[PDB]
Ligand binder design. Sequence first.
Ligand SMILES: [Zn+2]
Length: 138
Amino acid sequence: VEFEAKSARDGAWYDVAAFLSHRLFESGDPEVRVRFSGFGAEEDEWINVRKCVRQRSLPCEATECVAVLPGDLILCFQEGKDQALYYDAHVLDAQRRRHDVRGCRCRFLVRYDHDSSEEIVPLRKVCRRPETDYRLQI
Ligand SMILES: [Zn+2]
């Protein structure tokens, strides 16, 4: 019901407040005019519909870690030197650990798609693609 889009400024993903217009559909590769949440009109962007707009990646409740598998595309919270952004990343490996009452203890070796840098992150930094929800049924 809610959407995220990738900004050209940093290549990171942000919540979509509204879709205002679209163009280039006749090319088979349309773009949509996106207003991002909390950013006014001044920072609207023309964004590729097929590649850079999608249903929102949701944070994981402690039980959702089993739906995160090596090979998966995930949206990952990269706390950089002094900017913190959500970037596409792929799971290289998953260290399963028995949870506590604190929640999930699993850690994930991830590789960010844009710079191929790697990081071991907890579930808190992982947002799944809704595509993987079916894993929860299995
Ligand atoms: Zn876990």
